[PDB]
From Swiss-Prot, chains D, E:
Glycans are attached at residue 76. The Ig-like C2-type 1 domain mediates homodimerization and interaction with JAML. It comes from Homo sapiens (Human). Residues 1-102 form the Ig-like C2-type domain. Expressed in pancreas, brain, heart, small intestine, testis, prostate and at a lower level in liver and lung. Isoform 5 is ubiquitously expressed. Isoform 3 is expressed in heart, lung and pancreas. In skeletal muscle, isoform 1 is found at the neuromuscular junction and isoform 2 is found in blood vessels. In cardiac muscle, isoform 1 and isoform 2 are found at intercalated disks. In heart expressed in subendothelial layers of the vessel wall but not in the luminal endothelial surface. Expression is elevated in hearts with dilated cardiomyopathy. This is Coxsackievirus and adenovirus receptor. Component of the epithelial apical junction complex that may function as a homophilic cell adhesion molecule and is essential for tight junction integrity. Also involved in transepithelial migration of leukocytes through adhesive interactions with JAML a transmembrane protein of the plasma membrane of leukocytes. The interaction between both receptors also mediates the activation of gamma-delta T-cells, a subpopulation of T-cells residing in epithelia and involved in tissue homeostasis and repair. Disulfide bonds join 21-88. Monomer. May form homodimer. Interacts with LNX, MAGI1, DLG4, PRKCABP, TJP1 and CTNNB1. Interacts with MPDZ; recruits MPDZ to intercellular contact sites. Interacts with JAML (homodimeric form). Secreted isoform 3, isoform 4 and isoform 5 can interact with the extracellular domain of the receptor.
Amino acid sequence: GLPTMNTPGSCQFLTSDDFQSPSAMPQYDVTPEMRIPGEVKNLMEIAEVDSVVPVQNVGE
Amino acid sequence: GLPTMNTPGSCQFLTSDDFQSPSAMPQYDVTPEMRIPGEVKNLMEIAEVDSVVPVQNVGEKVNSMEAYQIPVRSNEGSGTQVFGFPLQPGYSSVFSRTLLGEILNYYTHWSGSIKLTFMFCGSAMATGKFLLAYSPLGAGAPTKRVDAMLGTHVVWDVGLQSSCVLCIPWISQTHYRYVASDECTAGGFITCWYQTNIVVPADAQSSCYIMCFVSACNDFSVRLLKDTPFISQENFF
Amino acid sequence: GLPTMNTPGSCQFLTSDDFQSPSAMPQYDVTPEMRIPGEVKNLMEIAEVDSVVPVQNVGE
Amino acid sequence: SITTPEEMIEKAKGETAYLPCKFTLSPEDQGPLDIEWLISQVIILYSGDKIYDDYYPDLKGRVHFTSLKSGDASINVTNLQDIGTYQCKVKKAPGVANKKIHLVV
Amino acid sequence: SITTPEEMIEKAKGETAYLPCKFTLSPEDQGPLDIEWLISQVIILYSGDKIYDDYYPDLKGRVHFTSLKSGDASINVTNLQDIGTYQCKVKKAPGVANKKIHLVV
Amino acid sequence: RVADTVGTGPTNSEAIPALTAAETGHTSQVVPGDTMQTRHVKNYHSRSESTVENFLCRSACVYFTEYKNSGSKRYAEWVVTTRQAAQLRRKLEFFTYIRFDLELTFVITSTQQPSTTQNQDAQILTHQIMYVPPGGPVPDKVDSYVWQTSTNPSVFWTEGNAPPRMSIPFLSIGNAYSNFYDGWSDFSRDGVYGINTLNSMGTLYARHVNTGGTGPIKSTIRIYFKPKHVKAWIPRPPRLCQYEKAKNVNFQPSGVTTTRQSITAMT
Amino acid sequence: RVADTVGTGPTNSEAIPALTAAETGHTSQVVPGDTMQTRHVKNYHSRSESTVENFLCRSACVYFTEYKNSGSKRYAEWVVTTRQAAQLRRKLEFFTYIRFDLELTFVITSTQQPSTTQNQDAQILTHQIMYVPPGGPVPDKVDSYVWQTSTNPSVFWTEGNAPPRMSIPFLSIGNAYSNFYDGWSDFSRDGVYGINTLNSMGTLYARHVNTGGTGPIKSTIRIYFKPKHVKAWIPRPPRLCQYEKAKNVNFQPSGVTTTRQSITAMT
Amino acid sequence: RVADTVGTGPTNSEAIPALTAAETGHTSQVVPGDTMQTRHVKNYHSRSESTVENFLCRSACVYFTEYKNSGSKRYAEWVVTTRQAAQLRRKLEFFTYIRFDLELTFVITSTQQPSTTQNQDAQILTHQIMYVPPGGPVPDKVDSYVWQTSTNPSVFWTEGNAPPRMSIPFLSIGNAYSNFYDGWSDFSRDGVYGINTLNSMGTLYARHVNTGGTGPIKSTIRIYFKPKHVKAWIPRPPRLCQYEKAKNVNFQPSGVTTTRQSITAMT
Amino acid sequence: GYSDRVRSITLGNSTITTQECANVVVGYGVWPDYLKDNEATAEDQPTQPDVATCRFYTLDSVQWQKTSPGWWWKLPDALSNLGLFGQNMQYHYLGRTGYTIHVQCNASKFHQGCLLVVCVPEAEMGCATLDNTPSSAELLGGDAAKEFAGEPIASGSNKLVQRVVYNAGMGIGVGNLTIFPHQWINLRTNNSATIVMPYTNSVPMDNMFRHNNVTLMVIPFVPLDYCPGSTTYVPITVTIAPMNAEYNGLRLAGH
Amino acid sequence: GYSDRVRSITLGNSTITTQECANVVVGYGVWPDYLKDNEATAEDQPTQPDVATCRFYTLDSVQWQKTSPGWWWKLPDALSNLGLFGQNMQYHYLGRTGYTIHVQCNASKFHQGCLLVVCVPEAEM
Amino acid sequence: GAQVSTQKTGAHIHYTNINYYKDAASNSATRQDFAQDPGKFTEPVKDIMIKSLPALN
Amino acid sequence: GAQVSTQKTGAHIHYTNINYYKDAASNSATRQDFAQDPGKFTEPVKDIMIKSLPALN
Amino acid sequence: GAQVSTQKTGAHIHYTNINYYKDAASNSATRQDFAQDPGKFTEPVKDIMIKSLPALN
């Protein structure tokens, strides 16, 4: 065996980590993707689009 | 899977280890750095900078600006000692709160030279000659000017130039001295005497003052970081 | 993550193992070595040196 | 740390007996200096930079420090009668050293 | 967060005393605003966007907010007699700050 | 590596290296050979452990809070700030501006609180540490919807595992964390004045995922900060007087230095 | 990396960049220099954390259920659906269609329930999480033949170990999960109407492999969903009103926006 | 690899290898063939396990101290020194000067002390081992600010994990640790005389991070030192008499060697 | 011939001349310069007067009594009400500017004394009462001496800033201040001291009213001493000249 | 720049600095040097400390009253009891050494006076 | 068969990734995809509208 | 894609570092940076002052 | 950057070592150093004494 020591932070769960994990169902043939009009790759593209501003937010 | 055995020391926390750890927030676009005048990359650069030394730390004077001034005056005599302090940049109170000494209190081992720079802040007409002298460890602190004359000394004379530097050499059996007090690594004794007398003309003050600065030469080194003993805390603020 | 299994003998302490372990104080500038007369590299060199033998170990 | 920890000081009755407890501090020692003297029970105490008589009836006002944190904790007991083992325990957090002095007459 | 937390306001008897408790909120602070005033025990309370007399007998109907969540929680106590330390405790989940005012006459 | 000394013999010349003028503000660059005779010594010493990175890279606890599993204080809420502690705070202050990444490590410790409930057979405790970014929703009860975790970075650590360690990238709107701020948040110059006005790094919430057992258990969480990839600007004199508050630099006047016997005393 | 600004001087020309026609539906592409004078600033800022992948990659709890080791509720049965929670559901809704892989993580926590049985020395608990694909046999009791596991993917996790994490590949008969479905399952248009009709992702079953001990223990299992390899289509306005149900988009009418004092008020 | 023997036949010559003069201090380099007839034997034996490194590389306990979690002795304070033990101390003494790196390993063991408090359900113990460098602040109570850890190297180890192991680089102001020092710290020659005067390696502090439970628990910490990268100078005769003190070489006079029956006895 | 002492600094429309002066201290080694585009963050075209603002302003002289503990001037606040530098500061939101501090104090050969002319970045100061912070007009002074006080300031329910000279109001050793660019006015040799301070802030530009980046502190380490018959009123006058002023965000005047 | 007045002499481990000084007088024009072998007469190997003895010794100050006639110091006798120069002088029989005399007397601008600092060989009195 | 890519660093470094599981649905999240095209949602008009030129002629 | 650098050893050896996390804020501490320049704080004068030459001419 | 050296085997094989920590004081023990010189302690005489030749002539 390869001698290793576990550094602090092992055996913990982090909500913001990207790692690998064995697939529950192996060799699943995913349904092939198609072309859907309007793919979004960045949130800022949506921010650039116009949006009406409720300036008169007074009372009722 | 790859067969591994965990060596002793695994699953422990060490305050002095450098390793990798997953970032809580991935792909954070840090704010780009700019140019700020005076980047510091090494603590020793700060130690090299001059720092006033409270040589007159006597009694209540540590509670006033009188701590830094060293008093000199025209007295009918010669060889009278002006001041004196041990070479313990870490433990000696004279050096403890100086910029070199306080940074040193964050370490355990020190080695190198010291640039004690003495600035005469007397009148423009006052002319005083002084025997700055450093005695190497081994014997008792010099009690007379003749005793100090033997050890390393500079006959500082006051003229147009005011300040004179006494570059304390690194004389020691050990490559590094302890920042704290120890009989084994006694640094030595630094003292000043009157080579002649500070003579002044009439209508001029006969009580001049001298300020002393401390700095580390370009051959100063520190090792073994430790927490400083000057700070204190009872509960979180 | 890399899938590993811990072989028997892991998480144990052995008095006669040579391995690596993180230094408590990093980047400590050790004091440079000098020349000291009589470096010893092997115990047998000391065994070769003469030693008086108490042959008359009788009584007092 | 204390010099000559085992000592046997014999002195005639009537003159002050000087009991030395000179000590040297290691670099590792950075603690409040507690010096306590015991007889065979506490004769004197030094904590918080002050000296304590400790209301010892046999030796009240006859025991005082000859010198202090400088490294001297000796005591000059005056007007002896007192015969016993005098233990001086200078205290530091990393190491606490004690010195035992046997006094005769 | 509260401006000038330690304050000593001395005012003669007969005129309204203005006790300021102006506070600034950090970005980290996103909690219900609970403002409570204490005297030396609860004079007024502000929870759920409403003001509470709290049935304090010494100061009933003489204590009111001068201004609110905008950052002002001052009180103009009217018709003083009341001498004591008035504590204003604006409350936020990350940090809760308190201001103590000593009132004289 | 440190510079070494150069040999020198006896000298007698108009040039004076010792005599200088400290009024200029230039610290004299005088080597030992200038005022005496010295031999050529090769100094192999290295200023490696005095580096800014090595100086401030040690993990150092900043704040410990204690939350019980049953009672009034179910969860612990601490605003992130290095000013709560003393040693790490003083270390960082040495530099007016500082830009460092963080490697937070949490040392959590449980304790069976004295009680009278019998048959106390508690199962292994599970803890959750959630970082609320400033302006984010903050939990009010131990079981609010905020604890479910939508986008905030939180770590779930079962007790007995190696202590959780999540690295934090530099988090400041400016170009560097300002250790000292001689300014007010309000243009009017009325309000809070100091470091607290510009430094908000979010809030940290710690809670028990499971109650654990019948008997009450109190969990102490210690938070450790270790600056890494540190860059420091404008060195400043170290804090001489003891700290009194976390949000301000207010101090109690203290003697420049511990006194000695006389001006010629050697102790 | 974000685009930067370009310098501009004073201008006086027939061309007007500001005056436009918003009726066309083209958001004007006006840079700051068009309506003023601006300097050439190199913006090094990067739109890296606003990416769709970074936006929805955070682990976020969707549903927590509690099953006891002895009593009525021996096992927990939850139909897989991201609509049960609020934060993750709202995050996903931003896009009418979405295609993402899943990385389910289970945070299981036990608790000694108050009782009167003495000598409670429970052994370490062992749990089993079984995913029944739609149309598969579903367990009725905690010890039915279904629990033995024939082909369904199940994970066995002893308590005190790191939380179980199994990745799930995209699971949809269509070419993308439909966040919104304006349709009925029945051609007649009578019956259930909405997302529930087209989204079935199976059922999740959690049970105690061993009873554990004499005393009753209640096990809380929290399920975390983190979309990965996400591709999103047709962005939609975020849900303004609070969710009321999991199977439908039904809402309670709410004010467009929180009100302020007047139309000129600055609070 | 060890040197081998060389063949020899009968000889008759003026040259005498056996007859020598031990007064010179040169140990005769006489091989077996010089005083007899010997065959050519290739000795494949290797002096590999007699190397200085292999001789002193074994982990060897130097000192064990016991600290309770509740009572007078909350924390344990031991000055670092290899003289406390006997086997490792004697191994090191063989060389007047020695220069070795250290690999400290701590074996901590807890024990439920007999008491009368009922419902003792203690949670897993957490321990902290702090190395105070000489001249550094030293803790007085179990909860002083020193324990928070500012820059001193400390290790936090939860019980049941693999024993903590931190390596220490050579730590000596001189160029080598001096096993024997025939000198006084004071120039006057009055005061402590011996190895203790020049060897200060700091102090070690061990404490319970959490009290652990209702009942008192006593924690025994054993410290193991293993010299590595060892270089030794000036070999010296091994200590014949039993050690009596840790700070000095003082001994009790002992017989050169265990006696036998007569000068011709074979036992 | 040549002489090191003499020096003449010309800026804008006002120049200064010092017969005896020590070498100028150029901040941290970085001469002040305009904001480079590699690190700009304000998209507005900055106005740069470059003569109107970059000129030597002479503040109010202060007496150096034998009992005077020290003085501190918040540089941005000091010039807030002087000339266009003040007007443009009032109008614009953001403001970036380097400084050319120059302190004059001339005394005859028979006087003695020593000043520490040091400019401290981020001089966050501490109030007499630990809980509250100092108020504006106590911490700040408009063309005002803002003198230090040797005695520790009594701590009560107030907002008086600690003027303790031996701490400099920052709870730090006054002797250790030397780390900041500093020039000494030893009366025996040099009657003037000049420090050229670069713009030292963590952000590319900051509102000058909102925050004061640097503060000139004059702390007499050695007290003035003279024999009877010499002039008893020797003043200290400070002439601070801004350099490379750059302003953004034009708004209505005020604060 | 340059200035004739300032001068710094370093010898052994002790150096002196004079802000105002007149040009050094180098004896009769011959800087002191070790005994060359062309003219040696002692066959013993000479010891040359060269740091232990070649250092600035400061003697006792004397007051310059308005009534002070003069002073004389026999250089070898003056250092007979100071440091190793004195010890080695006591031990060894023969002794050859050059000298670097330096006399300091500082007074304010309003004082007046004049000394004759002259070293006389063979001052038989 | 290791893939080496640049780490996300500040403005004004490499990391090594090896795919262990062969399923390919277990791969780490593909965060480093900084590609955008606002034309689909912003400026969706059939005929180009130059901003400088008048919109409705 | 492994980076090999010299280990910190005494005076009078290599180690291999591989960056696992792609964030680049998770990299180990950059301790081996022995670069210094005292000119910024020490000797900050505008005009060079040769130590051998007189300071104030 | 892996260093390959021979394993200690019997008489009449390779192992791979990679230095993880950059400190260099954490390296495994250097056991494989079989170098000896008895001349320093054994045979320390200034003038060589050939064993075959008579010792004291």
